[PDB]
Symmetry: C3
Amino acid sequence: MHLKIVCLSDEVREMYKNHKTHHEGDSGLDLFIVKDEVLKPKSTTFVKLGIKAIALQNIVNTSFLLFPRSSISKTPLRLANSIGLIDAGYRGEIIAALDNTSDQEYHIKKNDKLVQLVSFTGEPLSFELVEELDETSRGEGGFGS
Amino acid sequence: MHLKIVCLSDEVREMYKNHDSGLDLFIVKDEVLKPKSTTFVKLGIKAIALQNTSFLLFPRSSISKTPLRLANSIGLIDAGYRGEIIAALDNTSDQEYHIKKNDKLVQLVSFTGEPLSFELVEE
Amino acid sequence: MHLKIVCLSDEVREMYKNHSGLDLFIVKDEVLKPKSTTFVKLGIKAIALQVNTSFLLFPRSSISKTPLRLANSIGLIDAGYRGEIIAALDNTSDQEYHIKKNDKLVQLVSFTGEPLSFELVEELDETSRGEGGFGS
Ligand SMILES: O=C(NCCO)[C@H](CCOC(c1ccccc1)(c1ccccc1)c1ccccc1)Cn1ccc(=O)[nH]c1=O
Ligand SMILES: O=C(NCCO)[C@H](CCOC(c1ccccc1)(c1ccccc1)c1ccccc1)Cn1ccc(=O)[nH]c1=O
Ligand SMILES: O=C(NCCO)[C@H](CCOC(c1ccccc1)(c1ccccc1)c1ccccc1)Cn1ccc(=O)[nH]c1=O
Protein backbone atom coordinates (compact mmCIF):
# COMPACT_ATOMS: atom_id res chain seq x y z
CA MET A 1 0.00 0.00 0.00
CA HIS A 2 1.44 3.40 -0.70
CA LEU A 3 0.56 6.46 1.42
CA LYS A 4 0.74 9.99 0.13
CA ILE A 5 1.05 12.46 2.95
CA VAL A 6 0.54 16.25 3.11
CA CYS A 7 2.29 17.78 6.14
CA LEU A 8 0.29 20.76 7.35
CA SER A 9 3.33 22.81 8.40
CA ASP A 10 7.02 22.94 7.70
CA GLU A 11 7.85 21.71 11.19
CA VAL A 12 5.76 18.57 10.50
CA ARG A 13 7.38 18.11 7.05
CA GLU A 14 10.72 18.21 8.89
CA MET A 15 9.63 15.35 11.20
CA TYR A 16 8.51 13.03 8.32
CA LYS A 17 11.58 13.85 6.10
CA ASN A 18 13.71 12.57 8.99
CA HIS A 19 11.67 9.41 9.74
CA LYS A 20 13.43 6.96 11.79
CA THR A 21 11.61 4.87 12.71
CA HIS A 22 10.13 3.07 9.63
CA HIS A 23 11.88 0.29 7.64
CA GLU A 24 11.65 -2.34 5.16
CA GLY A 25 8.66 -4.41 6.02
CA ASP A 26 6.88 -2.85 8.75
CA SER A 27 3.09 -3.42 8.63
CA GLY A 28 2.52 -0.13 10.44
CA LEU A 29 3.71 3.40 9.84
CA ASP A 30 4.22 5.30 13.14
CA LEU A 31 2.71 8.75 13.32
CA PHE A 32 4.16 11.60 15.43
CA ILE A 33 2.60 13.80 18.02
CA VAL A 34 3.47 17.20 16.57
CA LYS A 35 3.02 19.63 19.49
CA ASP A 36 3.38 19.36 23.30
CA GLU A 37 -0.03 19.08 24.82
CA VAL A 38 -1.67 18.32 28.19
CA LEU A 39 -4.59 15.83 28.17
CA LYS A 40 -7.10 16.44 30.99
CA PRO A 41 -7.77 13.65 33.52
CA LYS A 42 -10.59 11.25 32.83
CA SER A 43 -11.23 12.82 29.39
CA THR A 44 -11.20 12.17 25.63
CA THR A 45 -8.93 14.54 23.68
CA PHE A 46 -9.10 14.82 19.88
CA VAL A 47 -5.37 15.16 19.10
CA LYS A 48 -4.58 16.59 15.58
CA LEU A 49 -1.67 14.83 13.93
CA GLY A 50 -0.66 17.70 11.55
CA ILE A 51 -1.08 15.60 8.39
CA LYS A 52 -3.62 14.51 5.77
CA ALA A 53 -3.25 11.30 3.77
CA ILE A 54 -4.52 9.00 1.08
CA ALA A 55 -3.59 5.36 0.51
CA LEU A 56 -3.14 3.82 -3.00
CA GLN A 57 -3.10 0.07 -3.72
CA ASN A 58 -4.31 0.60 -12.55
CA ILE A 59 -4.38 2.42 -9.16
CA VAL A 60 -7.09 2.75 -6.55
CA ASN A 61 -7.55 5.02 -3.67
CA THR A 62 -8.22 2.81 -0.51
CA SER A 63 -9.56 3.00 3.03
CA PHE A 64 -6.99 2.41 5.78
CA LEU A 65 -6.65 1.89 9.64
CA LEU A 66 -5.34 3.86 12.55
CA PHE A 67 -4.01 1.44 15.28
CA PRO A 68 -2.62 2.26 18.69
CA ARG A 69 1.09 1.47 18.91
CA SER A 70 1.90 -1.55 21.13
CA SER A 71 3.82 0.68 23.48
CA ILE A 72 0.70 2.83 24.26
CA SER A 73 -0.17 0.02 26.66
CA LYS A 74 2.42 1.22 29.26
CA THR A 75 0.61 4.63 29.37
CA PRO A 76 -2.97 5.30 30.65
CA LEU A 77 -3.89 6.45 27.06
CA ARG A 78 -6.35 4.38 25.09
CA LEU A 79 -7.78 4.85 21.59
CA ALA A 80 -11.45 5.87 22.11
CA ASN A 81 -12.71 4.33 18.86
CA SER A 82 -10.59 1.15 19.30
CA ILE A 83 -9.21 1.13 15.74
CA GLY A 84 -9.74 4.19 13.58
CA LEU A 85 -11.31 3.64 10.11
CA ILE A 86 -10.08 6.30 7.65
CA ASP A 87 -12.32 6.17 4.51
CA ALA A 88 -10.93 6.33 0.92
CA GLY A 89 -12.57 9.75 0.50
CA TYR A 90 -11.39 11.41 3.67
CA ARG A 91 -9.28 14.50 3.02
CA GLY A 92 -9.35 16.12 6.49
CA GLU A 93 -6.55 16.27 9.12
CA ILE A 94 -5.88 12.79 10.67
CA ILE A 95 -6.92 12.97 14.38
CA ALA A 96 -6.33 10.50 17.31
CA ALA A 97 -9.19 10.32 19.86
CA LEU A 98 -7.20 9.55 23.04
CA ASP A 99 -8.99 8.56 26.37
CA ASN A 100 -6.86 9.66 29.33
CA THR A 101 -7.86 6.86 31.78
CA SER A 102 -5.72 8.34 34.62
CA ASP A 103 -6.92 10.87 37.26
CA GLN A 104 -3.90 13.06 36.58
CA GLU A 105 -3.37 15.24 33.56
CA TYR A 106 -1.06 13.52 31.05
CA HIS A 107 1.71 15.31 29.09
CA ILE A 108 2.31 14.28 25.44
CA LYS A 109 5.35 15.71 23.68
CA LYS A 110 6.25 16.58 20.09
CA ASN A 111 7.99 13.44 18.65
CA ASP A 112 6.09 10.96 20.91
CA LYS A 113 4.61 7.99 18.86
CA LEU A 114 1.25 6.67 20.08
CA VAL A 115 -0.50 5.49 16.92
CA GLN A 116 0.37 4.05 13.52
CA LEU A 117 -1.36 3.74 10.17
CA VAL A 118 -2.06 0.27 8.85
CA SER A 119 -3.37 -1.29 5.59
CA PHE A 120 -6.44 -3.60 5.57
CA THR A 121 -4.09 -6.11 3.80
CA GLY A 122 -1.49 -6.04 6.58
CA GLU A 123 1.19 -5.69 3.90
CA PRO A 124 4.30 -3.52 4.22
CA LEU A 125 3.61 0.20 3.68
CA SER A 126 5.60 2.96 2.10
CA PHE A 127 4.96 6.68 1.88
CA GLU A 128 6.00 9.92 0.18
CA LEU A 129 5.34 13.45 1.14
CA VAL A 130 3.22 15.34 -1.35
CA GLU A 131 1.86 18.94 -1.66
CA GLU A 132 -1.72 17.93 -2.19
CA LEU A 133 -4.00 14.95 -2.19
CA ASP A 134 -6.26 16.07 -5.01
CA GLU A 135 -7.45 19.29 -6.72
CA THR A 136 -9.77 20.34 -3.84
CA SER A 137 -9.01 22.99 -1.23
CA ARG A 138 -9.64 20.47 1.56
CA GLY A 139 -7.15 18.13 -0.30
CA GLU A 140 -4.87 21.23 -0.27
CA GLY A 141 -4.69 21.32 -4.11
CA GLY A 142 -6.01 23.37 -7.02
CA PHE A 143 -5.95 27.15 -7.83
CA GLY A 144 -5.17 29.82 -5.20
CA SER A 145 -5.75 29.77 -1.42
CA MET B 1 -18.44 -7.50 0.21
CA HIS B 2 -22.19 -8.14 0.11
CA LEU B 3 -24.44 -8.65 3.17
CA LYS B 4 -27.81 -10.35 3.22
CA ILE B 5 -29.52 -8.93 6.34
CA VAL B 6 -32.63 -10.39 8.04
CA CYS B 7 -34.53 -7.82 10.11
CA LEU B 8 -36.22 -9.15 13.24
CA SER B 9 -39.22 -6.88 13.70
CA ASP B 10 -41.13 -4.86 11.12
CA GLU B 11 -40.12 -1.55 12.60
CA VAL B 12 -36.45 -2.63 12.05
CA ARG B 13 -37.33 -3.59 8.45
CA GLU B 14 -38.52 0.07 8.13
CA MET B 15 -35.29 1.54 9.52
CA TYR B 16 -33.12 -0.36 7.04
CA LYS B 17 -35.35 0.44 3.97
CA ASN B 18 -34.86 4.11 5.03
CA HIS B 19 -30.99 4.41 4.97
CA ASP B 20 -18.29 4.16 2.69
CA SER B 21 -16.13 1.34 3.86
CA GLY B 22 -18.47 0.48 6.77
CA LEU B 23 -22.28 0.05 7.03
CA ASP B 24 -23.81 1.86 10.02
CA LEU B 25 -26.08 -0.21 12.28
CA PHE B 26 -28.97 1.38 14.22
CA ILE B 27 -29.80 1.24 17.87
CA VAL B 28 -33.17 -0.40 17.60
CA LYS B 29 -34.87 0.44 20.97
CA ASP B 30 -34.35 3.09 23.70
CA GLU B 31 -32.30 1.80 26.62
CA VAL B 32 -30.48 3.10 29.63
CA LEU B 33 -26.93 1.78 30.25
CA LYS B 34 -25.91 1.76 33.90
CA PRO B 35 -22.85 3.65 35.09
CA LYS B 36 -19.60 1.58 34.92
CA SER B 37 -21.13 -1.32 33.22
CA THR B 38 -21.05 -3.53 30.22
CA THR B 39 -24.36 -4.11 28.37
CA PHE B 40 -25.04 -6.51 25.56
CA VAL B 41 -27.13 -4.43 23.15
CA LYS B 42 -29.20 -6.49 20.65
CA LEU B 43 -29.28 -4.87 17.20
CA GLY B 44 -32.49 -6.34 15.73
CA ILE B 45 -30.70 -8.14 12.86
CA LYS B 46 -28.96 -11.30 11.71
CA ALA B 47 -26.59 -11.10 8.73
CA ILE B 48 -24.36 -13.12 6.42
CA ALA B 49 -21.68 -11.86 4.08
CA LEU B 50 -20.74 -12.84 0.57
CA GLN B 51 -17.48 -12.02 -1.17
CA ASN B 52 -19.41 -17.08 2.63
CA THR B 53 -17.21 -14.83 4.83
CA SER B 54 -16.27 -13.42 8.27
CA PHE B 55 -16.73 -9.75 8.86
CA LEU B 56 -16.08 -7.06 11.50
CA LEU B 57 -17.99 -4.85 13.90
CA PHE B 58 -16.25 -1.49 14.45
CA PRO B 59 -17.33 1.38 16.68
CA ARG B 60 -18.28 4.43 14.64
CA SER B 61 -15.84 7.32 14.89
CA SER B 62 -18.50 9.48 16.58
CA ILE B 63 -18.79 7.01 19.58
CA SER B 64 -15.70 8.84 20.87
CA LYS B 65 -17.70 11.87 21.98
CA THR B 66 -19.80 9.56 24.16
CA PRO B 67 -18.54 7.55 27.13
CA LEU B 68 -19.45 4.24 25.46
CA ARG B 69 -16.66 1.86 24.24
CA LEU B 70 -16.85 -1.43 22.53
CA ALA B 71 -15.86 -4.05 25.13
CA ASN B 72 -14.30 -6.56 22.80
CA SER B 73 -12.41 -3.72 20.85
CA ILE B 74 -13.53 -4.91 17.37
CA GLY B 75 -16.16 -7.63 17.07
CA LEU B 76 -15.27 -10.64 14.98
CA ILE B 77 -18.30 -12.22 13.29
CA ASP B 78 -17.48 -15.64 12.05
CA ALA B 79 -18.68 -16.88 8.60
CA GLY B 80 -20.69 -19.54 10.52
CA TYR B 81 -22.68 -17.18 12.75
CA ARG B 82 -26.51 -17.16 12.25
CA GLY B 83 -27.49 -15.40 15.51
CA GLU B 84 -28.68 -11.92 16.19
CA ILE B 85 -25.85 -9.31 15.98
CA ILE B 86 -24.95 -7.89 19.40
CA ALA B 87 -22.80 -4.96 20.46
CA ALA B 88 -21.03 -5.19 23.85
CA LEU B 89 -20.81 -1.67 25.08
CA ASP B 90 -19.03 -0.46 28.20
CA ASN B 91 -20.27 2.71 29.73
CA THR B 92 -17.17 4.23 31.14
CA SER B 93 -19.10 7.07 32.75
CA ASP B 94 -20.11 7.51 36.42
CA GLN B 95 -23.59 8.32 35.01
CA GLU B 96 -26.27 6.43 33.26
CA TYR B 97 -26.26 7.00 29.49
CA HIS B 98 -29.44 6.87 27.32
CA ILE B 99 -29.26 5.34 23.83
CA LYS B 100 -32.27 5.89 21.48
CA LYS B 101 -33.96 4.14 18.56
CA ASN B 102 -31.99 5.33 15.44
CA ASP B 103 -28.68 6.17 17.17
CA LYS B 104 -25.68 5.01 15.12
CA LEU B 105 -22.86 3.70 17.39
CA VAL B 106 -21.51 0.73 15.51
CA GLN B 107 -20.76 -0.31 11.87
CA LEU B 108 -20.12 -3.44 9.95
CA VAL B 109 -16.91 -3.77 7.91
CA SER B 110 -15.22 -6.29 5.71
CA PHE B 111 -11.69 -7.62 6.14
CA THR B 112 -10.78 -6.08 2.76
CA GLY B 113 -11.97 -2.65 3.73
CA GLU B 114 -13.89 -2.39 0.43
CA PRO B 115 -17.21 -0.50 0.32
CA LEU B 116 -20.12 -2.62 1.39
CA SER B 117 -23.57 -3.50 -0.13
CA PHE B 118 -26.62 -5.10 1.51
CA GLU B 119 -30.11 -6.37 0.74
CA LEU B 120 -32.87 -7.09 3.23
CA VAL B 121 -34.03 -10.79 3.15
CA GLU B 122 -36.31 -12.73 5.58
CA GLU B 123 -34.32 -15.94 5.79
CA MET C 1 -3.29 -18.73 6.50
CA HIS C 2 -1.13 -21.27 8.28
CA LEU C 3 0.48 -20.68 11.68
CA LYS C 4 3.60 -22.43 12.88
CA ILE C 5 3.80 -22.32 16.69
CA VAL C 6 6.70 -23.10 19.03
CA CYS C 7 5.58 -24.00 22.56
CA LEU C 8 8.07 -22.64 25.11
CA SER C 9 7.61 -25.50 27.61
CA ASP C 10 6.27 -29.06 27.48
CA GLU C 11 3.27 -28.08 29.61
CA VAL C 12 2.30 -25.59 26.94
CA ARG C 13 2.92 -28.19 24.24
CA GLU C 14 0.37 -30.46 25.98
CA MET C 15 -2.29 -27.74 25.91
CA TYR C 16 -1.96 -27.04 22.18
CA LYS C 17 -1.72 -30.76 21.23
CA ASN C 18 -5.12 -31.26 23.04
CA HIS C 19 -6.81 -28.01 21.75
CA SER C 20 -11.65 -17.59 11.74
CA GLY C 21 -10.00 -16.85 15.12
CA LEU C 22 -7.60 -19.25 16.77
CA ASP C 23 -7.94 -19.16 20.55
CA LEU C 24 -4.77 -18.87 22.68
CA PHE C 25 -4.52 -20.15 26.27
CA ILE C 26 -3.57 -18.49 29.49
CA VAL C 27 -0.66 -20.81 30.39
CA LYS C 28 -0.16 -20.09 34.13
CA ASP C 29 -2.38 -18.91 37.05
CA GLU C 30 -1.68 -15.32 37.80
CA VAL C 31 -3.25 -12.48 39.76
CA LEU C 32 -3.79 -9.14 38.00
CA LYS C 33 -3.62 -6.15 40.31
CA PRO C 34 -6.53 -3.72 40.52
CA LYS C 35 -6.56 -0.82 38.00
CA SER C 36 -3.51 -2.08 36.16
CA THR C 37 -2.08 -3.09 32.81
CA THR C 38 -0.22 -6.47 32.89
CA PHE C 39 1.80 -7.99 30.03
CA VAL C 40 0.64 -11.56 30.16
CA LYS C 41 3.18 -13.96 28.48
CA LEU C 42 1.37 -16.65 26.43
CA GLY C 43 4.24 -19.26 26.28
CA ILE C 44 4.36 -19.52 22.47
CA LYS C 45 6.17 -17.92 19.55
CA ALA C 46 4.47 -18.07 16.11
CA ILE C 47 4.80 -17.33 12.39
CA ALA C 48 2.03 -17.03 9.84
CA LEU C 49 2.58 -18.41 6.31
CA GLN C 50 0.56 -17.58 3.18
CA VAL C 51 5.77 -16.56 2.64
CA ASN C 52 5.74 -14.89 6.16
CA THR C 53 2.82 -12.64 6.96
CA SER C 54 1.67 -10.10 9.65
CA PHE C 55 -1.30 -11.12 11.79
CA LEU C 56 -3.65 -9.84 14.54
CA LEU C 57 -4.35 -10.54 18.17
CA PHE C 58 -8.02 -9.86 19.03
CA PRO C 59 -9.78 -10.24 22.32
CA ARG C 60 -12.25 -13.07 22.40
CA SER C 61 -15.90 -12.01 22.42
CA SER C 62 -16.41 -13.53 25.90
CA ILE C 63 -13.73 -11.24 27.51
CA SER C 64 -16.62 -8.69 27.53
CA LYS C 65 -18.26 -10.23 30.59
CA THR C 66 -15.03 -9.77 32.66
CA PRO C 67 -13.44 -6.50 33.51
CA LEU C 68 -10.32 -7.31 31.34
CA ARG C 69 -9.75 -5.32 28.14
CA LEU C 70 -6.95 -5.39 25.56
CA ALA C 71 -4.84 -2.26 26.28
CA ASN C 72 -3.59 -1.78 22.69
CA SER C 73 -7.19 -2.58 21.22
CA ILE C 74 -5.97 -5.12 18.63
CA GLY C 75 -2.39 -6.30 18.62
CA LEU C 76 -0.45 -6.13 15.35
CA ILE C 77 2.22 -8.94 15.10
CA ASP C 78 4.73 -8.14 12.21
CA ALA C 79 5.82 -10.81 9.65
CA GLY C 80 9.27 -10.67 11.27
CA TYR C 81 8.47 -11.29 14.76
CA ARG C 82 10.09 -14.13 16.70
CA GLY C 83 9.41 -12.90 20.25
CA GLU C 84 7.09 -14.61 22.74
CA ILE C 85 3.39 -13.54 22.09
CA ILE C 86 2.11 -11.23 24.98
CA ALA C 87 -1.40 -9.99 25.72
CA ALA C 88 -1.43 -6.48 27.28
CA LEU C 89 -4.52 -6.79 29.66
CA ASP C 90 -6.06 -3.81 31.45
CA ASN C 91 -7.81 -4.92 34.67
CA THR C 92 -10.51 -2.15 34.80
CA SER C 93 -11.82 -3.41 38.21
CA ASP C 94 -10.78 -2.12 41.63
CA GLN C 95 -10.21 -5.70 42.84
CA GLU C 96 -7.44 -8.04 41.83
CA TYR C 97 -8.46 -10.51 39.19
CA HIS C 98 -7.44 -14.19 38.92
CA ILE C 99 -6.67 -15.62 35.51
CA LYS C 100 -6.12 -19.42 35.35
CA LYS C 101 -4.12 -21.82 33.24
CA ASN C 102 -6.51 -22.79 30.32
CA ASP C 103 -8.59 -19.56 30.34
CA LYS C 104 -9.13 -18.23 26.85
CA LEU C 105 -9.05 -14.45 26.65
CA VAL C 106 -7.51 -13.71 23.29
CA GLN C 107 -7.25 -15.14 19.70
CA LEU C 108 -5.03 -14.92 16.62
CA VAL C 109 -6.62 -13.76 13.42
CA SER C 110 -5.61 -13.20 9.85
CA PHE C 111 -5.80 -9.91 8.06
CA THR C 112 -7.80 -11.82 5.44
CA GLY C 113 -10.29 -13.16 7.95
CA GLU C 114 -9.73 -16.57 6.28
CA PRO C 115 -10.11 -19.69 8.40
CA LEU C 116 -6.76 -20.67 9.87
CA SER C 117 -4.83 -23.82 10.70
CA PHE C 118 -1.76 -24.33 12.89
CA GLU C 119 0.98 -26.90 13.42
CA LEU C 120 3.31 -27.19 16.41
CA VAL C 121 6.90 -26.90 15.30
CA GLU C 122 10.26 -26.93 17.16
CA GLU C 123 11.79 -23.79 15.67
CA LEU C 124 10.71 -20.83 13.60
CA ASP C 125 13.97 -20.50 11.74
CA GLU C 126 17.71 -21.03 12.42
CA THR C 127 18.26 -18.13 14.85
CA SER C 128 18.36 -18.45 18.63
CA ARG C 129 15.39 -16.03 18.92
CA GLY C 130 13.64 -18.45 16.50
CA GLU C 131 14.55 -21.31 18.91
CA GLY C 132 16.58 -22.87 16.05
CA GLY C 133 20.11 -23.70 15.00
CA PHE C 134 23.16 -25.06 16.79
CA GLY C 135 23.03 -25.07 20.67
CA SER C 136 19.35 -24.14 20.01
O1 LIG D 1 -14.46 11.52 8.96
C1 LIG D 1 -13.87 12.08 9.84
N1 LIG D 1 -14.01 13.38 10.03
C2 LIG D 1 -14.78 14.27 9.15
C3 LIG D 1 -14.44 15.68 9.64
O2 LIG D 1 -15.21 15.90 10.84
C4 LIG D 1 -13.07 11.16 10.75
C5 LIG D 1 -13.21 11.51 12.20
C6 LIG D 1 -14.62 11.88 12.69
O3 LIG D 1 -14.35 13.16 13.32
C7 LIG D 1 -14.20 13.24 14.76
C8 LIG D 1 -15.61 13.25 15.34
C9 LIG D 1 -16.71 13.52 14.48
C10 LIG D 1 -18.03 13.57 14.98
C11 LIG D 1 -18.24 13.38 16.36
C12 LIG D 1 -17.16 13.13 17.23
C13 LIG D 1 -15.85 13.07 16.72
C14 LIG D 1 -13.28 12.08 15.26
C15 LIG D 1 -13.80 10.92 15.87
C16 LIG D 1 -12.96 9.86 16.28
C17 LIG D 1 -11.56 9.94 16.07
C18 LIG D 1 -11.00 11.06 15.45
C19 LIG D 1 -11.88 12.14 15.05
C20 LIG D 1 -13.64 14.63 14.96
C21 LIG D 1 -13.68 15.56 13.90
C22 LIG D 1 -13.13 16.85 14.10
C23 LIG D 1 -12.58 17.24 15.32
C24 LIG D 1 -12.57 16.32 16.38
C25 LIG D 1 -13.11 15.06 16.19
C26 LIG D 1 -11.61 10.87 10.33
N2 LIG D 1 -11.02 9.91 11.30
C27 LIG D 1 -11.58 8.73 11.58
C28 LIG D 1 -11.00 7.89 12.55
C29 LIG D 1 -9.89 8.33 13.23
O4 LIG D 1 -9.43 7.56 14.10
N3 LIG D 1 -9.34 9.55 12.97
C30 LIG D 1 -9.88 10.34 12.02
O5 LIG D 1 -9.43 11.46 11.69
O1 LIG E 1 -21.28 -16.07 18.83
C1 LIG E 1 -21.74 -15.01 19.22
N1 LIG E 1 -22.90 -14.83 19.85
C2 LIG E 1 -24.03 -15.71 20.21
C3 LIG E 1 -23.60 -17.16 20.14
O2 LIG E 1 -23.11 -17.46 21.45
C4 LIG E 1 -20.86 -13.80 19.03
C5 LIG E 1 -20.49 -13.12 20.38
C6 LIG E 1 -20.48 -14.06 21.61
O3 LIG E 1 -21.70 -13.94 22.42
C7 LIG E 1 -21.83 -13.04 23.55
C8 LIG E 1 -21.16 -13.64 24.81
C9 LIG E 1 -20.76 -14.99 24.83
C10 LIG E 1 -20.11 -15.60 25.95
C11 LIG E 1 -19.91 -14.83 27.08
C12 LIG E 1 -20.30 -13.48 27.10
C13 LIG E 1 -20.93 -12.90 25.97
C14 LIG E 1 -21.22 -11.75 23.04
C15 LIG E 1 -19.92 -11.32 23.40
C16 LIG E 1 -19.41 -10.12 22.86
C17 LIG E 1 -20.13 -9.32 21.95
C18 LIG E 1 -21.42 -9.74 21.63
C19 LIG E 1 -21.95 -10.94 22.14
C20 LIG E 1 -23.33 -12.97 23.90
C21 LIG E 1 -24.23 -13.95 23.46
C22 LIG E 1 -25.62 -13.90 23.81
C23 LIG E 1 -26.14 -12.87 24.61
C24 LIG E 1 -25.25 -11.89 25.06
C25 LIG E 1 -23.87 -11.95 24.70
C26 LIG E 1 -21.24 -12.92 17.81
N2 LIG E 1 -20.61 -11.58 17.96
C27 LIG E 1 -19.26 -11.38 18.01
C28 LIG E 1 -18.77 -10.09 18.22
C29 LIG E 1 -19.66 -9.06 18.41
O4 LIG E 1 -19.20 -7.92 18.60
N3 LIG E 1 -21.01 -9.29 18.36
C30 LIG E 1 -21.48 -10.53 18.14
O5 LIG E 1 -22.72 -10.82 18.09
O1 LIG F 1 7.10 -6.61 19.06
C1 LIG F 1 6.91 -6.79 20.23
N1 LIG F 1 7.89 -6.93 21.12
C2 LIG F 1 9.33 -6.88 20.79
C3 LIG F 1 9.96 -6.89 22.16
O2 LIG F 1 9.82 -5.51 22.53
C4 LIG F 1 5.41 -6.83 20.47
C5 LIG F 1 4.86 -5.79 21.46
C6 LIG F 1 5.76 -4.61 21.96
O3 LIG F 1 6.30 -5.16 23.20
C7 LIG F 1 5.68 -4.89 24.50
C8 LIG F 1 6.01 -3.48 24.89
C9 LIG F 1 7.08 -2.82 24.23
C10 LIG F 1 7.43 -1.51 24.52
C11 LIG F 1 6.73 -0.87 25.52
C12 LIG F 1 5.69 -1.51 26.19
C13 LIG F 1 5.28 -2.79 25.86
C14 LIG F 1 4.16 -5.16 24.33
C15 LIG F 1 3.22 -4.10 24.14
C16 LIG F 1 1.84 -4.38 23.93
C17 LIG F 1 1.39 -5.74 23.92
C18 LIG F 1 2.32 -6.78 24.14
C19 LIG F 1 3.70 -6.47 24.31
C20 LIG F 1 6.40 -5.74 25.54
C21 LIG F 1 7.67 -6.32 25.20
C22 LIG F 1 8.40 -7.12 26.13
C23 LIG F 1 7.85 -7.38 27.40
C24 LIG F 1 6.59 -6.81 27.75
C25 LIG F 1 5.87 -5.99 26.83
C26 LIG F 1 4.69 -8.15 19.99
N2 LIG F 1 3.26 -7.88 20.14
C27 LIG F 1 2.58 -6.86 19.52
C28 LIG F 1 1.21 -6.68 19.84
C29 LIG F 1 0.67 -7.56 20.79
O4 LIG F 1 -0.51 -7.45 21.16
N3 LIG F 1 1.37 -8.55 21.38
C30 LIG F 1 2.68 -8.71 21.08
O5 LIG F 1 3.38 -9.66 21.59
